[PDB]
Design a protein around this ligand. Structure first.
Ligand SMILES: [Ca+2]
Ligand SMILES: [Mg+2]
Lengths: 48, 197, 10, 146, 50, 48, 48, 212, 49
């Protein structure tokens, strides 16, 4: 957060699980998307 | 090819993986007060070249000299003031020296002495991979006018609305607002006593 | 060896 | 005293294309029978980097076909000799009368772009038709996308 | 060992001093090749393989 | 977590394309053994 | 599975080195049988 | 000596466009359509009179009518919004049109279960028996995860005198795609709610219920 | 090499950044201070025997 810029985004397995179970901990360390306001994870290695 | 990534057009990149130049009017840069800049999508091949100025340097050197059959005396002064080709006064070097050298012979004995003072003031345009001038400068699309970014009364050039937010900053901001100065003072000399016997 | 560097935005 | 970037032997005929597929039925040309709209496809050199063959790849957006076609680089024409194996799903394709026409087509934005046109047949097309795949080279502007 | 760093990036290009070699040897990431010279690339992306 | 789309620091961790020469834990290897493990050895020599 | 899946959530943003190792010991969360591309194409095959 | 790369840019001043009123509207055959309103601004000057509208609402012919509102820049740049107007069939039925809200007890069923509520859907009749439904899934993909309207399960259904509902057609654009089976469907002509459970892509199903 | 001026060793210390990757800069070395206009003769001894 100081040495580099923000590089990490939420990954798909963690987001789909916290969403399925209704867990409110989904708000701790993860931030809703700045575009639609929901939680989205990225499939590992699938940026490109 | 101009501003973009993945071969697609973008309004904000620090690079030139966009489409092949059209001449069409496209957008670019950030949005300020519900307004954005609009320019023909063409190449500006001189943009980095035009960013530089001409360095200027002026020097003044004097010396005073004389001798006898038993003695000699030299005294000199030099002055140098460089403001190099990168814009503003960040490329700076001021050199000042003063010297005084003498020798006197009285019989078999010879005593001589040299004493020198040196001043310098360096200012440097810092390099590196972060928010530095050149790293910020190379990360420009081939279509973007660099010298059009120096006017800070143009909101679109202010750091918050600079055309690209990717690890770089307006080069004229970095040169006008960062600091890396060095000032040095230095004295050196010698004393020599020669005696033949 | 030591030092490390970032990548870029894009 | 200017560096030439270079390229593969068939660079000017490789590319991304926004094509549509018409079909000749009863001798008259039918505009997109299958109603697939504008479809993306790619052409690109082979690993051998010859100037006499290139890949034709529909990306799976029409018939799911991809084959090597013979290339006349000077004439900017491509075709096959007869039916050639498909690499995507064990079929056969026949490419006839293909050509790449520099700066001939027009993007949706009203700008010149390269046109591409070729006739295609499939040995598993129970109707035995001959299709005309035609389009232009993708610019990279979202406005020229479908 | 017969090697020692003079300067070099972490996981990047690095300049060494190695025993039977000149001062300032460079090591850097090259792509994989098959026993016959050809460049190995990734089946899915096309990009070279380290 | 995964690699943010607009930056590029950790592409090779997410895509599993690092190698031994990527030194992806040399910093930590040095801290644990030439920092901590040595200090510990010294502690056990100095106090009873 | 429930103890392990909650152990995994629990170690997010706390101790990731352990999370990795407990995934390896207990092999839970399970590795999905679908590819990243199959999950991106039709989400319904994925077990969150 | 002389410099060759002055900025050629022109600063373009965009248009702001605000919709006043509902996005989706359901009217009965013969009932006039009154423009809910809109506001368009450009550089602070009011350009509401410049908005163009593409489409028309035939109140005397049941169906779906889309109106597109747009205002344009001086450089031709546009901002736009859509308003969709639906028309009923006039014929009586215990099913009344049209904007329904997913009620209290709607949940997954396979493989997990998760509670959702508060989402709006659209139901109107195009034929005295047949009704158009904008999302059989009560917005589990459309407006739950925000996947968009393409991920809403459109279709038709024909109200029975048992007040069960028999599905005519269903389709999800962007995945294939249609439902597997339809079960547990009936209407309480005094709630006034309609229940259904629908089974999706092989191992999914929901248990939703709607009310105005 | 050892700079020797008359003939006393001259300081030839260099002042440059210790992190060239993020804040690279170079401020001079000790020989850069001598004024060339003062030099009569320079003789470079190359061998170390
Ligand atoms: Ca300067
Ligand atoms: Mg230590």
């Amino acid at each position: 957060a100081v040495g580099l810029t923000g590089n990490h985004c939420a990954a798909y397995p963690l987001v789909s699980y916290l969403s399925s179970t209704g867990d409110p901990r989904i708000a701790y360390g993860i931030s809703k998307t700045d575009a639609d306001g929901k939680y989205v994870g990225q499939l590992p290695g699938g940026k490109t | 090819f101009g501003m973009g990534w993945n071969g697609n057009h973008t309004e904000l990149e620090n690079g030139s993986w966009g489409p092949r130049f059209d001449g069409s009017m496209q957008l670019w840069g950030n949005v300020y007060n519900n307004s954005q800049k609009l320019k023909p999508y063409v190449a500006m091949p001189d943009n980095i070249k035009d960013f530089f100025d001409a360095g200027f340097r002026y020097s003044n050197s004097l010396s005073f000299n004389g001798a006898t059959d038993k003695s000699d005396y030299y005294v000199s002064f030099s002055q140098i003031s460089d403001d190099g080709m990168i814009p503003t006064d960040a490329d700076s070097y001021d050199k000042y020296t003063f010297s005084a050298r003498g020798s006197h012979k009285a019989g078999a004995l010879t005593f001589s002495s040299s004493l020198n003072y040196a001043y310098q003031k360096n200012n440097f345009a810092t390099t590196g991979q972060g928010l530095s001038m050149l790293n910020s400068l190379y990360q420009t699309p081939r279509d973007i006018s660099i010298i059009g970014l120096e006017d800070q009364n143009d909101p679109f050039n202010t750091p918050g609305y600079y055309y690209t937010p990717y690890g770089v900053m307006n080069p004229y901001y970095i040169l006008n607002n960062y600091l890396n100065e060095y000032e040095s003072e230095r004295f050196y000399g010698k004393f020599q006593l020669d005696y033949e016997f | 060896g030591g030092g490390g560097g970032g990548g870029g935005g894009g | 005293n200017d560096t030439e970037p270079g390229g593969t032997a068939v660079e000017k005929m490789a590319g991304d294309w926004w094509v549509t597929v018409n079909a000749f039925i009863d001798g008259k040309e039918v505009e997109d029978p299958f109603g697939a709209g504008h479809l993306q496809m790619s052409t690109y050199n082979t690993a051998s980097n010859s100037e006499t063959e290139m890949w034709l790849d529909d990306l799976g957006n029409f018939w799911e076909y991809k084959l090597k076609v013979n290339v006349n680089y000077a004439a900017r024409t491509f075709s096959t000799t007869g039916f050639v194996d498909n690499v995507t799903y064990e079929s056969k394709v026949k490419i006839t009368d293909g050509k790449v026409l520099e700066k001939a087509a027009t993007t949706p934005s009203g700008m010149p772009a390269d046109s591409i046109v070729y006739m295609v047949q499939f040995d598993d097309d129970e109707d035995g038709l001959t299709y005309k795949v035609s389009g232009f080279r993708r610019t990279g502007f979202p406005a020229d996308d479908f | 060992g017969g090697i020692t760093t003079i300067y070099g990036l972490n996981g990047g290009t690095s300049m060494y001093a190695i025993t039977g070699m000149p001062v300032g040897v460079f090591k850097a990431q090259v792509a994989e090749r098959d026993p016959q010279g050809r460049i190995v690339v990734n089946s899915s992306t096309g990009l070279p393989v380290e | 977590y995964e690699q943010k789309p607009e930056s590029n620091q950790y592409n090779t961790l997410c895509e599993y394309t690092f190698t031994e020469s990527s030194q992806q834990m040399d910093y930590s290897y040095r801290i644990l053994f030439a920092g901590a493990l040595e200090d510990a050895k010294q502690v056990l020599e100095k106090t009873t | 599975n429930l103890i392990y899946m909650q152990k995994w959530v629990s170690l997010f943003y706390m101790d990731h080195m352990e999370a990795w190792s407990e995934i390896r010991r207990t092999d839970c969360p399970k590795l999905s049988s679908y590819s990243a591309a199959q999950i991106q194409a039709s989400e319904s095959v994925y077990t969150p | 000596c002389d410099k060759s790369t002055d900025d050629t840019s022109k600063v373009t001043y965009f248009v702001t466009l605000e919709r006043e009123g509902d996005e989706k509207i359901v009217l009965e055959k013969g009932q006039p359509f009154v423009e809910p309103g809109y506001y368009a601004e450009m550089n602070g000057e009011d350009i509401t009179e410049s908005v163009q509208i593409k489409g028309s609402v035939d109140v005397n012919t049941p169906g779906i009518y889309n109106l597109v509102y747009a205002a344009y820049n001086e450089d031709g740049f546009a901002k736009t919004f859509t308003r969709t107007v639906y028309v009923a069939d006039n014929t009586a039925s215990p099913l009344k049109s049209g904007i329904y809200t997913v009620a209290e007890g709607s949940k997954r069923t396979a493989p997990s279960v998760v509670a959702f509520s508060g989402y709006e859907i659209v139901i109107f009749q195009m034929e005295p028996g047949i009704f158009y439904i904008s999302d059989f899934l009560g917005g589990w993909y459309d407006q739950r995860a925000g996947y968009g309207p393409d991920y809403a399960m459109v279709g038709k259904f024909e109200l029975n005198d048992d007040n069960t509902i028999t599905p005519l057609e269903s389709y999800v654009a962007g995945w294939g795609d249609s439902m597997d089976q339809m079960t547990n469907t009936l209407l309480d002509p005094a709630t006034g709610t309609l229940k259904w459970t629908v089974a999706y892509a092989g191992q999914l199903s929901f248990d939703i219920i709607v009310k105005q | 090499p050892l700079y020797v001026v008359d003939g006393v060793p001259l300081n030839n210390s260099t002042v440059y950044s210790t992190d060239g990757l993020n804040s690279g800069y170079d401020f001079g070395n000790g020989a850069n201070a001598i004024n060339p206009d003062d030099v009569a003769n320079m003789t470079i001894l190359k061998g170390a025997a």
